[PDB]
Design a protein around this ligand. Structure first.
Ligand SMILES: COC(=O)N[C@H](C(=O)N[C@@H](Cc1ccc(-c2ccccn2)cc1)C[C@H](O)[C@H](Cc1ccccc1)NC(=O)[C@@H](NC(=O)OC)C(C)(C)C)C(C)(C)C
Lengths: 99, 99
């Protein structure tokens, strides 16, 4: 669809059976979700924001539906205040910025 | 224009006669620029992201040009790793998320 930016671009996502709310974020290279269970093994990764870095677990090839649109790719899990859909998955669902 | 997301959405902005590179950031409430000088009064503000909060300087009613689009709004200045155009200004230039 078309999402204007007067409010936070919060959308519904489906991941490992559960429905959650996520922020669509063009300012993020990666996708980062709050603490949860995912299948397979994970690698270590550190990701940086405005106030410093956090330690997250990296899962690969994770199935995730974003607002009707399927995506399969990298999901990081850790102590983020918000669920963040970053560019790795925004490109898969054909997301672009327009004006 | 239509900005894709394979790479970071970095555009040229004009603020205080200075040309600067900034990140178009839908996941940001506020607009935050690295250390620079601006005219007028200011208030301190605390803003949070991944890893926590930083203290910044809040300037009101600042004019910014983003890809030749004029816009007026609040500009925060402080020790951010990157120049960031948040939703408060992206709405002014008519910027939408599409897929
Ligand atoms: C309401 O709070 C805000 O709007 N905070 C904004 C903010 O931090 N937004 C983040 C989203 C966010 C929103 C709210 C909170 C929050 C905090 C406390 C309480 C509630 N919510 C936290 C994060 C996502 C933002 O796009 C950020 C921009 C950035 C990019 C690169 C370096 C520093 C900052 N992206 C990241 O942090 C990403 N970093 C990255 O890609 O590095 C290359 C990730 C996400 C991958 C680490 C801001 C500060 C830019 C205005």
């Amino acid at each position: 669809p078309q999402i204007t930016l007067w409010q936070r671009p919060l959308v519904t996502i489906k991941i490992g059976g559960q429905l959650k709310e996520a922020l669509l974020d063009t300012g993020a290279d990666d996708t980062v979700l709050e603490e949860m269970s995912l299948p397979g093994r994970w690698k270590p990764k550190m990701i940086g924001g405005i106030g410093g870095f956090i330690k997250v677990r990296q899962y690969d090839q994770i199935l995730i539906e974003i607002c009707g649109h399927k995506a399969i790719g990298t999901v990081l899990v850790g102590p983020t205040p918000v669920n963040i859909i970053g560019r790795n998955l925004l490109t898969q669902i054909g997301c672009t910025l327009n004006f």
